[PDB]
Amino acid sequence: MSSDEEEARELIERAKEAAERAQEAAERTGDPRVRELARELKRLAQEAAEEVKRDPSSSDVNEALKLIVEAIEAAVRALEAAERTGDPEVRELARELVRLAVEAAEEVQRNPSSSDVNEALKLIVEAIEAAVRALEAAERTGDPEVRELARELVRLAVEAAEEVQRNPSSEEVNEALKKIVKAIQEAVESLREAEESGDPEKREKARERVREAVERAEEVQRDPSGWLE
User: Fold this and answer.
1) Residues 134 and 79 in one domain
2) Is 103 among the domain residues?
3) How far apart are CA 137 and CA 146, in angstroms?
4) C-alpha to C-alpha distance for 174 and 178, rounded to whole angstroms
5) Hey, how many other C-beta atoms are within 10 angstroms of the C-beta on 24?
6) Residues 45, 144: one domain?
7) Looking at the domain assignment, is residue 93 inside a domain?
8) How many Å apart are CA 37 and CA 96, to the nearest integer?
9) Could you give the CA distance from residue 185 to residue 130 in angstroms, rounded to a whole number?
10) How many angstroms separate the CA atoms of 143 and 81, rounded?
11) What CA–CA distance (Å, rounded) separates 137 from 129?
12) Is residue 1 within 8 Å of 9, Cβ to Cβ?
């Protein structure tokens, strides 16, 4: 078996496992909307895998499948994280994140040759992963205020991700989401530091650190090109 052949077989298997996880996760939510989204994740994996199964010699087709599989895996993690929280607002944020993954994946499958559409999904996947980490970190604090701020922060990322999804070729919209993702990653790192500390003062510091990330993300959405920075 050649290298292209081996890579194809491996990716098709990875796609199958992803869609299967998506199936399982969605049926556990009992939300008919999430079941529909997971059905859509499965459909996209099969459509993208079917192209690779036909002809595994195209770099673009194999790259499209790989990115779509990464999007499904991230969507799966979002749904699993939401279920762990038992929190209805977090479940709704997860639904919103999964919907964005679906819509961005649909654009990739339709246009595998487009660098922009590829970049949009890539960045959106990174945003989903960062958002899930922020929500998980906030949940671990058990603190109502940190949790609420994390949700505010993820909503700003969702609104910026939608802009990217709808305008993949706009560099300004891309840079805005990158800045917000950076702010989320900084919030996550601050929460980790406070979590590994036994200092109550470090926990109040955490609230404020997440608050500063929210204020940063709000500033970015008001001035996405950083004209004022």
Assistant:
1) no
2) no
3) 9
4) 6
5) 13
6) no
7) no
8) 10
9) 6
10) 17
11) 12
12) yes
SS3 129: helix
Question: 195 and 214 in contact (C-beta within 8 Å)?
Answer: no
58 secondary structure, DSSP code: -
Q: How far apart are CA 161 and CA 107, in angstroms?
A: 14
Cβ atoms of 194 and 181 within 8 Å: the answer is: no
Asked if residue 162 is part of any domain, the answer here is yes
Within 10 angstroms of residue 194's Cβ, the number of other Cβ atoms is 22
Q: What is the resolution of this structure in A?
A: 1.9
Cα–Cα distances in angstroms (integers) from residue 53 to residues 22, 26, 46, 96, 118, in the given order: 21, 26, 10, 31, 21
* Alpha helices for the chain (secondary structure H): 3-29, 32-54, 59-85, 88-110, 115-141, 144-166, 171-195, 200-222
Question: Residue 176: inside a domain, yes or no?
Answer: yes
Q: Are residues 144 and 203 in the same domain?
A: yes
Tally of structural domains, the chain: 2
Same domain for 65 and 11: yes
User: Considering all CA atoms of the chain, what is the largest pairwise distance in Å, rounded to the nearest integer?
Assistant: 60
